């Protein structure tokens, strides 16, 4: 993948609180979209959501995400430029207290 689509998904990881990669088939960026949205109350205007399977750029969003942080899958998730990772990932951040304290600046 160019250096220039790099660029560009680093672009979009500091433009928004929260970015996350999903595909609207995916069960795992449902659960990690419903976890932000309906449970933890977080705004649609903090959240970059990419359906990628929706965008021409996808399949390249895609391999940037890789060439970036080295996962293969969506849901991928970043918040305040942190990478977070998947479904998993979140849910963890959630029970040991770090979730609360990423998300209080940007919720307050």
């Keep these: 993948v160019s250096q220039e ?5 680093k672009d979009l990881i500091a433009e928004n609180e929260i970015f996350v990669a999903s595909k609207t088939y995916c069960p795992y960026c449902h659960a990690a979209l419903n976890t932000l949205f309906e449970k933890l ?6 959240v970059l959501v990419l359906q990628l399977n929706d965008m021409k750029e996808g399949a390249d969003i895609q391999a940037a995400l890789y060439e970036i942080n080295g996962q ?37």
């Design 41 to 46: 109350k977080v705004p649609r205007s903090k």
């Design 5 to 9: 689509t790099i660029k560009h998904v």
């Design 72 to 108: 293969r899958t969506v849901p991928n998730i970043y918040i305040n430029g942190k990478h977070i990772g998947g479904n998993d990932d979140l849910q963890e951040l959630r029970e040991t207290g770090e979730l609360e304290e990423l998300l209080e600046p940007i919720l307050a």
